Amino acid sequence: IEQPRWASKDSAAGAASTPDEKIVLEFMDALTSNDAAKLIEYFAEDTMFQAMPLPPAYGRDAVEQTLAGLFTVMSFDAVETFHIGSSNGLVYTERVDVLRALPTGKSYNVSVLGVFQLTEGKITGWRDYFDLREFEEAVDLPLR
Amino acid sequence: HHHTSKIEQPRWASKDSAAGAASTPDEKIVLEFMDALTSNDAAKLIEYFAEDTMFQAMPLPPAYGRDAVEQTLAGLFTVMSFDAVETFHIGSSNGLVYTERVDVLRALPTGKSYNVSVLGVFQLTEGKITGWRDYFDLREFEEAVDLPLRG
């Protein structure tokens, strides 16, 4: 994970400053477990998840199942957040996702900017924005 | 070709009236800049940018420096039009503004449009943009409007 030339050089750039931002960074770190049943405990009943190039899942069940599905084909290997901010109950994270395709054994660093919506310390919404094509090509695995 | 103007509120969008409005001076500059994008006028837009700045539509190579940004944005405006923007959420922290939007982009060679779901980050110092990065999927756009920007 190279520090992009545009990443802040401030020692606090990618660190938490509120309880909600803290919940997210911990949830981000937990992703490396590739355990949907574990991660769903971070989510509220009324929630949704969407990797924006792909369709969205609505409901705590749909999110768990979607994450489980993703984990049968891909390993969350590492994360680093270069910027984190929040406002009005939404947490934004500019980060890098190291993803590893199990069927083909290839890996690619995905530049991601995500948004989280939290109520009472639980996630009511999660959307990651990135380019799907370049990831697919780099790991020889189509996901659409 | 036809394409409707009304942009539907996503099911996941916040119904908090404050979520989509500017609460600080840095957030207001960004919303002004997002309304100024419909001008497709690099010369008008670069006035928002500092000398030490950068811009990158992440699926495409970045541009560093004020001159590079202007030429890159101008280049875009020869092939695509910026027809409309709606920002569902805008947030702010430690000099970085974030905006969850839909960019209604139209390909000039074909006349076709597409709603691009975008999440963006802006870096500001003294009210001038030192950085702008928009995260989205490019293939969705290329295929929808039949305008190839990457080979």
Author numbering:
A (entry chain A): 5 to 148
B (entry chain D): -1 to 149
Task: Please give me the paper's original passages concerning this structure.
We report an in silico strategy for the biocatalytic synthesis of chiral N- and O-heterocycles via Baldwin cyclization modes of hydroxy- and amino-substituted epoxides and oxetanes using the limonene epoxide hydrolase from Rhodococcus erythropolis. We turned to cofactor-independent limonene epoxide hydrolases (LEHs) that normally catalyze direct hydrolysis of epoxides by positioning and activating water at the active site. On the basis of the well-documented mechanism of ReLEH, a water molecular is positioned by H-bonds to N55 and Y53 while D132 abstracts a proton from the water, enabling a smooth nucleophilic attack on one of the substrate’s epoxide carbon center. We have rationally engineered the epoxide hydrolase ReLEH with construction of a general platform for Baldwin cyclization reactivity of hydroxy- and amino-epoxides and oxetanes.
In curiosity-driven experiments, the mutants SZ612 (Y53F/N55A/I80F/L114V/I116V) and SZ621 (Y53F/N55A/I80F/I116V) produced only the Baldwin product 2 with none of 3 nor of the vicinal diol 4 as side-products. Consequently, the representative substrates in complex with LEH mutants, including the models SZ612‒(R)-1 and SZ616‒(R)-1, were constructed by molecular docking. In model SZ612‒(R)-1, the dihedral angle θ was mainly gathered between 0o and 180o during the MD simulations, suggesting that attack from the Re-face is unsupportive for SZ612. Moreover, for both of the SZ612 and SZ616 mutants, the slightly shorter distance d1 was observed during the simulations, indicating that the ON atom preferentially attacks C1. Furthermore, to better illustrate the bond forming and breaking in the Baldwin/anti-Baldwin selection pathways, the hybrid QM/MM scheme was employed, enabling the calculation the activation energy barriers.
